């Protein structure tokens, strides 16, 4: 069936240039006009860009007029977006989609979208986390169940796994989402519930691997 | 009786005004078929951007 494909996201300092790209597969490329759409967090779902089928009028949103440049090649059936002076706001998943088939008289918009690709425009330098444990006490016992964890503070960028015990330990696992802080770094935490009657005897380890830097640690929780 | 059967005519000439303000639902529903047949010079002249 239909099928979009967007590349060339990644992490970006503000003020420099991206170009994403976006290949378009299962249909007749070239008879159909194009959409950028992005989404974030704070904004939600946002228009940025369409381009006509020739390439002969193109529109973009108001925030972004003047600095992107949506355009197309026919022949190689991709779409491109090239993205100049980033600025913070625009960190983003960025979606391709592709202009329904309808009638000469009506108006038209999207039917099918890519796959997304991120976008991150930040300052930060790419940096290992620290791992610091979540040590269960009595302040963390109710009855027979206590609660453990792993934080992993001060990384960029997004994303890192955490596992438990090399995968060994899954029910019970909760990893929050990433939140970003003052000082463009992410840190997340990982807690997981075990019976209170295997403190001190059963070993945890949490395995936070991070790509972008090659970061493994196996951090050991210890009780207090 | 044998009442005047005609205007004052020094009745009231002007507005109620609080006559009827709403739409009246029996009103004319259908086009009016002597209307403005010829195209507004005063239309939208730019391109939609909506277009196929």
């Known amino acids: 069936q239909v099928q979009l494909v967007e590349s060339g996201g990644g992490v970006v300092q503000p003020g420099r240039s991206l170009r994403l790209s976006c290949a378009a597969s299962?249909?007749?490329?070239?008879?159909?006009?194009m959409h950028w759409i992005r989404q974030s967090p704070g904004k939600g779902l946002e228009w940025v860009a369409i381009?006509?089928?020739?390439?002969?009028?193109?529109y973009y949103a108001d925030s972004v007029k003047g600095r992107f440049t949506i355009s197309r090649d026919n022949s190689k059936n991709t779409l491109y977006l090239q993205m100049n002076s980033l600025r913070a706001e625009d960190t983003a998943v960025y979606y391709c989609?592709?202009?329904?088939?309808?009638?000469?008289?009506?108006?038209?918009?999207?039917?099918?979208w890519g796959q997304g690709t991120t976008v991150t425009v930040s300052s930060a330098s790419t940096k290992g986390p620290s791992v610091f444990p979540l040590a269960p006490s009595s302040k963390s016992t109710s009855g027979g169940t206590a609660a453990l964890g792993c934080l992993v503070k001060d990384y960029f960028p997004e994303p890192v796994t955490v596992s438990w015990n090399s995968g060994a330990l899954t029910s019970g696992v909760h990893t929050f989402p990433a939140v970003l802080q003052s000082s463009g770094l992410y840190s997340l935490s990982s807690v997981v519930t075990v019976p209170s009657s295997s403190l001190g005897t059963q070993t945890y380890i949490c395995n936070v691997n991070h790509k972008p830097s090659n970061t493994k640690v196996d951090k050991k929780v210890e009780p207090k | 009786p044998n009442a005047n059967p005609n205007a004052n005519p020094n009745a009231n000439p002007n507005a109620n005004p609080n006559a009827n303000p709403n739409a009246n639902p029996n009103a004319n529903p259908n086009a009016n078929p002597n209307a403005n047949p010829n195209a507004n010079p005063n239309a939208n002249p730019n391109a939609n951007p909506n277009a196929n």
């Open positions: 299962g249909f007749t490329f070239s008879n159909f006009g």
């Open positions: 989609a592709k202009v329904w088939f309808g009638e000469s008289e009506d108006n038209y918009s999207v039917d099918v």
């Open positions: 381009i006509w089928y020739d390439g002969s009028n193109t």
